[PDB]
Design an enzyme around this catalytic site. Structure first.
Site, PDB file in Angstrom:
ATOM      1  CE  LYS F 154       4.450   4.135  31.320  1.00  0.00           C
ATOM      2  NZ  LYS F 154       5.537   5.088  31.622  1.00  0.00           N
ATOM      3  CD  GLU F 180       9.841   4.421  27.097  1.00  0.00           C
ATOM      4  OE1 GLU F 180      10.025   3.260  27.515  1.00  0.00           O
ATOM      5  OE2 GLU F 180       9.695   5.398  27.859  1.00  0.00           O
ATOM      6  NE  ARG F 181      12.607  -0.254  29.359  1.00  0.00           N
ATOM      7  CZ  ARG F 181      11.596  -0.109  30.202  1.00  0.00           C
ATOM      8  NH1 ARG F 181      10.373   0.154  29.774  1.00  0.00           N
ATOM      9  NH2 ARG F 181      11.818  -0.227  31.507  1.00  0.00           N
TER      10      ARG F 181
END
Ligand code: ATP
Ligand code: ATP
Ligand code: ADP
Ligand code: MG
Ligand code: MG
Ligand code: MG
Lengths: 503, 48, 465, 42, 48, 469
Positions: F154, F180-181
């Site tokens: 993704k 997210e990261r």
């Protein structure tokens, strides 16, 4: 706040002394949770001290009482005991004085080697570095295993999950990674040195003692901190231990040095955190876990970062361990940590008992850093290996009922079988990057097609010895060049053919 | 193929012939026998 | 001081005190009871009321009944005077041989030994069981778990370990019957007095029995394992002995904790268990270890509910054991006894530097053939044996020979099987499996490998056919 | 260890029909016979 | 043809037995999922 | 008015007021706090107490600490001054480039556009991805969802869509990093700077970034998607621009709402989630739309927990999207990249009257061959390839050629693999798959179809293989 003594003194209008703003009294104590009346000036997640000398942390601040988790056995805590504010949130000692020492979650030494002369203390709940202070992961973190450093590479500053069932080799991967850093810590290159930190959560004390015995025998203890919150310790200690070990590794990361953290294992920390949440009467969720069990691991692992050159350039590498139940990675806790980390190293019991050790499932193991976490020589040979293993994967199924195969297909099948036997490796023997590149290069260039797979390991030792004391000029040539030139490829092939003739 | 142990056991009996008459040319009717026996005695196959 | 009963709900009793509350884990004695009813303080509820767990039945208890504080936890007799005797959870002798006259007492709640007091040495404990000695060898001083369902054989396996190891043992033994059959306790007790391990005549007894069985209330079943630990801890620490501790079975400690936890007002954990499942188990299991003062070799039968190894109570017990022996119902239904799963039993001493290169390579070779057999069994089930002609059929033939040769007649199972019990030296075991792996016995029928100990009895059985 | 073709959809190697999604050994058989035919063609 | 007929006959019987065991396993797993999910909802509702 | 903290339990803070209570969704600010902790009112508990969720860490909070009511919801800076800047959940600049000096502020909570304001324009957006352009083509101004598990691609796909669309779009773009990261946010920020989408010197910046990552509390992760949406709504409404809204990952909005819902006094729903899952998602998603004033082309990455598409969070998200591309682990394990499932990805503009008759017939023809391939694989397992007849031989052979040809090298994935990135026009994609369906390339090997952009490179790769071998 309606207890019988407090209600009665409110009727009398006594205006009692011993004001409860920096102190309080226990209402109820049980299962490591103390409900305390008073402590009006207390902070959230603040350390407290009981009258028996035990410590505690105030998690639930409520209008009537304070919910406090107990750092130890609650048999000492009694109803009506005086609880005092420490004044600060939980902090642990940090520094290089902890290298070679075994400590608990609070930093107290448990190896019997005397007090730790640490100068600085950091709170365990610091915020992770932002977008600006960190730079892209570029430095290789050498695990020492051929199947890891080629196919699932780990870079300095990266969270890499080691996930598998029980007794699949997860601790074996992590300990061998710590042992492999002996080569770099002995060298004079300060940039390639790695100070490992091992966090044992919920294990046996005899298991941790066997770990320290292994690290001391291999002389890996000089650069290793062992944070130990075993099964006999309280659930708050096992919950706090990953954050204590992270803070110790954050000292190296913020001071320009490179550190490696192993959380063995984070699945037990979730169990300890679930126990505290259930006994704090917080409502559970999936598998009785609290809602914040994802934020538990996300705020821990996000502190593993590769800092920019303006922040010292240091890195913090995390290797969390997650145990699955019969390979079910669809459970609540394994799914969360997979979505957090930058990669996975899946270990399967079926591959473990088929002779494939380490039992890494290459089809399930990913690494989001990719070739940037590999050196130039390894990237040249692992890319060709990944193509050949892909070609071998297409043709490995022919042994089921196939009988006649094409000559090129047979060569692909033979070379891939050699490569699968090449990825096997014994325990407690991590090999250097130059040895891994040279053996993989021989595997993918057809230098092992004439060798039976049973003698691959014997070739891996003896031929590497032959090119070590006699052809060390070639090793210096590759080290200065950084890759494999066609002339050096021809020279290595001639040495291989000469050695195989002598073999 | 996939009719049971027909071509496998017949080829196994043929392998026993290769251990009894190694210098006998064999005329096969079917590709499955050729697939099994070419690796062992491809030098002693007349026609398939 | 003196308290009064406020509430009785099952095994959980709430006692309110007037002057001073007893601490947690203290023992309380109910006054108007003709036998001794002991309450163990679990938590302080507030308003000078403590919530306790009864070690016996709570019927006949009225609210307002006087409760005395002993001022100490449950103290049980410890020492040589407990050898040859049977005691319950609270240390009372239940062998009808008089009181246990001793000057030494010890609380059943103790802290686990520290990290400094740990022994890292590992030596192989030879059993005489071929599947155990080859694939998951036991360490001489270490924690051994016997996982299995109901009827797969764990009492038989632990009785064979008593017959083999504990008879020729230079030290003391402790048996902790935790939530098992009282018939089995009577059988084991008379087995000891017949084998001479328990001497009713003189002081030459070598085993102490602690029994809290499945007819006991949940408070007794969740604390009687601690009483067996306390007897074994005295022998390890205060005498420096090498102790054997057989617990049958340790799941009942965890199961009884879940039954009490329903009445303690806790939010239930996964699969209805207590929230403190891992912490209570960890506190109990860390006390069972070998220290520098003395060694304890512990064998713990572990019941799995509904044959589920992913249940929280067996799953958390896996990390507490050096060697695990997982017993499978599918293997037991094949007639292979002992029904040890070869691909699910680990040892933590299965190392070339501990047990030798040839022992390790044979064990890994056996597991590789059996894992290849499990991969091929789906083709065998649906299609049939017609696969890969010589190669896969040789894998199947060798693996089935290995599966038969893992079976072994037990001396304790000789009554209901007829086959004489075999004690097989480990050198004969690795020699026997090396002969099967090398293909030296491919011509023998696989019936000849079944229920015979040495490999010389395999070829003798084949010649008999 | 490479996720052999037909071992299962999402289990390392596979993707396709019901047999290939289920994995095991029949998915290995499907991948073996299919790849043998298309390697013979090439 | 006789071998292929009895091989498919054995394969169909064995697949039929495997269908019956997998159907009972599916029914047990379906019932266990419904029970486990409801207990989680009840525990969350009772803890409020 | 002024209030005082009553309880602090996790990321949920109860505060009590003496004057009039603040409304729900109002922003409250804790006074004795250095990094400006902000609480958002979630519910009125009665007895002059409201219950709030914290947008930052709750450590060090004291019962009785003064809380100030701002009189409005969370207001963030909006406008051209946000272009080339990184904002947190509450609009503070986290790119260390000084304050965001602007005159326009907008509340992050707003009503969705009405039914009268809906636009029914549907034109195909060409992305250069062959599986995307053929089988599930994206629409300009429509909502795009990238479904998938962990590690299926993704993030790489949304980086490739940024490279192929947002670099030469025309009009502003907004990226919202939701849970997210932080490494990925740092990687994207420097990739935008190198690409020229972010200018650290000029005012020619095109993209505005809003980031709330995994280290954030559940309150921040459940509101940062509304912060990025507010920036996109300002560009759509108050400027009439065409806006690209890239969100990764939108599942973290749902997940962060489930983390605090237990502490808000709610009975859990099925699987385990907030009972307000569909309503909270519906209010957020219906703000992300094309009005008649302007268009927002939304590309949202959607995490599928444990690859279970029947999980309530991906299942509720399906009804909110015009085009959904499902990334499958089974497709990714075969080596096919991008891992879009051809028989699980749908588009609304996949119509004969929208994309043409030839595009529709080839796309349906491709999906028919791939579906027959899955049906035939069970016969291949039992009967074998020997007994299949020449019709099913051509079905399997063309399906493998089609399945390999759906793969494509990405420019943003060149550092991962080494293959050069390729962009394919829609006309070349239609012509390439028509040739495989017609059987014009039945003599070519199937390896020539793997990781090649156009069909002319398939012929060139086959000739290179034949000449080398
Ligand atoms: N590469 C290897 N080669 C040989 N033996 C190995 C290898 N890796 C692990 N082992 C052995 O396998 C056993 C289990 O491995 P290990 O204890 O590292 O796994 P684990 O997942 O940490 O287990 P646990 O669930 O008990 O923590 C040990 O006896 C170890 O020595
Ligand atoms: N070694 C063996 N040899 C022969 N039969 C055996 C053996 N072990 C177990 N069995 C069979 O299985 C039965 C169960 O024995 P055992 O009591 O040991 O099982 P268990 O696991 O302890 O079950 P429970 O849960 O009932 O205690 C025996 O009575 C016998 O029929
Ligand atoms: N287009 C692609 N080409 C090659 N590999 C890819 C591609 N997309 C994803 N991958 C693989 O997936 C990994 C990154 O996955 P990612 O996009 O981060 O997953 P997620 O979106 O679930 O976070 C990389 O290591 C890479 O090997
Ligand atoms: Mg381990
Ligand atoms: Mg039993
Ligand atoms: Mg992603």
């Amino acid at each position: 706040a309606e207890i019988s003594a407090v209600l009665e003194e409110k009727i009398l209008g006594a205006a009692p002394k011993e004001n409860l703003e920096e102190t309080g009294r226990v209402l109820s104590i049980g299962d490591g949770i103390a409900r305390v009346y008073g402590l009006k000036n207390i902070q959230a997640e603040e350390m407290v001290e009981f009258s028996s000398g035990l410590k505690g942390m105030a998690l639930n601040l409520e209008p009537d009482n304070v919910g406090i988790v107990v750092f130890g056995n609650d048999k000492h805590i009694k109803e009506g005991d005086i609880v005092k504010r420490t004044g600060a949130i939980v902090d642990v000692p940090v520094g290089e004085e902890l290298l070679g020492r075994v400590v608990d979650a609070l930093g107290n030494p448990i190896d019997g080697k005397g007090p730790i002369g640490s100068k600085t203390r950091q709170r365990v709940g610091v915020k992770a570095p932002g977008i600006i202070p960190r730079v892209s992961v570029r430095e290789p973190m050498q695990t020492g295993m051929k199947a890891v450093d080629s196919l699932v590479p780990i870079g300095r500053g990266q969270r890499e999950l080691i996930i598998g069932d029980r007794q699949t080799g997860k601790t074996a991967i992590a300990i061998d990674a710590i042992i492999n850093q002996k080569r770099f810590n002995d060298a004079q290159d300060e940039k390639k040195k790695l100070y490992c930190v091992y966090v044992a959560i919920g294990q046996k004390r005899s298991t941790v003692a066997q770990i320290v015995k292994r690290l001391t025998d291999t002389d890996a203890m000089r650069y290793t901190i062992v944070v130990s919150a075993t099964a006999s310790d309280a659930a708050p200690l096992q919950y706090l231990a990953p954050y204590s070990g992270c803070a110790m590794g954050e000292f190296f990361r913020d001071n320009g040095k490179h550190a490696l953290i192993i959380y063995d294992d984070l699945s037990k920390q979730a169990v300890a955190y679930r126990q505290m949440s259930l006994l704090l009467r917080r409502p559970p969720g999936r598998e009785a876990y609290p809602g914040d069990v994802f934020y538990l691991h996300s705020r821990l692992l996000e502190r593993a970062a590769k800092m920019s050159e303006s922040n010292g350039g240091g890195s913090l590498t995390a290797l969390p361990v997650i145990e699955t139940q019969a390979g079910d990675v669809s459970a609540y806790i394994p799914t969360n940590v997979i979505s957090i980390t930058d990669g996975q190293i899946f270990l399967e019991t079926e591959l473990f008992y088929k002779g494939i050790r380490p039992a890494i499932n290459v089809g399930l193991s990913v690494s989001r850093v990719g070739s940037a976490a590999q050196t130039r020589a390894m990237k040249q040979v692992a890319g060709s290996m990944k193509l050949e293993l892909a070609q071998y994967r297409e043709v490995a199924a022919f042994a089921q009922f196939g009988s006649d195969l094409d000559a090129s297909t047979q060569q692909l099948l033979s070379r891939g079988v050699r490569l699968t036997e090449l990825l096997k490796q014994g325990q407690y023997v991590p090999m250097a990057i130059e040895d891994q590149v040279a053996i993989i290069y021989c595997g993918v260039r057809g230098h092992l097609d004439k060798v039976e797979p049973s003698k691959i390991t014997k070739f891996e030792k003896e031929f590497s010895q032959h090119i070590k004391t006699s052809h060390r000029d070639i090793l210096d040539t590759i080290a200065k060049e950084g890759q494999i030139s066609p002339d050096t490829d021809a020279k290595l092939k001639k040495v291989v053919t000469d050695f195989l003739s002598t073999f | 193929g996939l009719c049971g142990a027909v071509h496998s056991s017949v080829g196994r009996q043929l392998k026993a012939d290769l251990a009894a008459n190694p210098d006998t040319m064999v005329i096969c009717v079917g590709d499955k026998i050729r697939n099994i026996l070419q690796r062992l005695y491809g030098n002693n196959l007349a026609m398939v | 001081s003196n308290g009064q009963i406020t509430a009785v709900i099952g095994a959980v009793v709430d006692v309110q005190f007037e002057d001073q509350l007893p601490p947690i884990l203290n023992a309380l004695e109910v006054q108007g009871r003709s036998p001794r009813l002991i309450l163990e303080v679990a938590q302080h509820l507030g308003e000078n009321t403590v919530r306790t767990i009864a070690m016996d039945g709570t019927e006949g208890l009225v609210r307002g009944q006087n409760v005395l504080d002993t001022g100490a936890p449950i103290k049980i007799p410890v020492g040589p005077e407990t050898l040859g005797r049977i005691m319950n959870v609270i240390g009372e002798p239940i062998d009808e041989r008089g009181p246990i006259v001793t000057d030494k007492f010890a609380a059943i709640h103790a802290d686990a030994p520290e990290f400094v007091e740990m022994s890292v040495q590992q030596e192989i404990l030879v059993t005489g069981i071929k599947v155990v000695d080859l694939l998951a060898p036991y360490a001489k001083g270490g924690k051994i778990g016997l996982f299995g369902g109901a009827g797969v054989g764990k009492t038989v396996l632990i009785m064979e370990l008593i017959n083999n190891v504990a008879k020729a043992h230079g030290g003391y033994s402790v048996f902790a019957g935790v939530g098992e059959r009282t018939r089995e306790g009577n059988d084991l007790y008379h087995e000891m007095i017949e084998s001479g391990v328990i001497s009713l005549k003189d002081k030459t007894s070598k085993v102490a029995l602690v029994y809290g069985q499945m007819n006991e209330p949940p408070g007794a079943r969740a604390r009687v394992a601690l009483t067996g630990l306390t007897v074994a801890e005295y022998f390890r620490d205060q005498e420096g002995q090498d102790v054997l501790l057989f617990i049958d079975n340790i799941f009942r400690f965890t199961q009884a904790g879940s039954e009490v936890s329903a009445l303690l007002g806790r939010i239930p954990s996964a699969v209805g268990y207590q929230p403190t499942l891992a912490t209570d188990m960890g506190t109990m299991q860390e006390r069972i270890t070998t220290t520098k003062k003395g060694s304890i070799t512990s064998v713990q039968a572990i019941y799995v509910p509904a044959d589920d190894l992913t249940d929280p109570a067996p799953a958390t017990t896996f990390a507490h054991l050096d060697a695990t022996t997982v017993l499978s119902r599918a293997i037991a239904e094949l007639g292979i006894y002992p029904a040890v799963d070869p691909l699910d039993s680990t040892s933590r001493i299965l190392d070339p530097n501990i047990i030798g290169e040839e022992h390790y390579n044979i064990a890994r070779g056996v597991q590789k053939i059996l894992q290849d057999y499990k991969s091929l069994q789906d083709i065998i089930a649906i299609l049939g044996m017609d696969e890969l002609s010589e190669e896969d059929k040789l894998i199947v033939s060798r693996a089935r020979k290995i599966q038969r040769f893992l079976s072994q007649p037990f001396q304790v199972a000789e009554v209901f099987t007829g086959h004489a019990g075999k004690l097989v030296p480990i050198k004969d075991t690795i020699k026997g499996f090396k002969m099967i792996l090398n293909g030296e016995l491919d011509h023998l029928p696989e019936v000849a490998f079944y229920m015979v100990g040495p490999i010389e009895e395999v070829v003798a059985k084949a010649e008999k056919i | 260890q490479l996720g052999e073709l037909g071992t299962g959809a999402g289990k390392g190697g596979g993707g396709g029909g019901s047999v290939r999604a289920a994995g095991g050994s029949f998915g290995r058989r499907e991948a073996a016979e299919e790849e043998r035919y298309f390697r013979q063609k090439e | 043809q006789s071998s292929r007929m009895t091989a498919m006959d054995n394969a169909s019987k064995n697949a039929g037995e495997m269908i019956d065991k997998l159907t009972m396993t599916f029914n047990r797993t379906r019932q266990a999922v419904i029970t486990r999910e409801l207990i989680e909802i009840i525990s969350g509702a009772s803890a409020l």
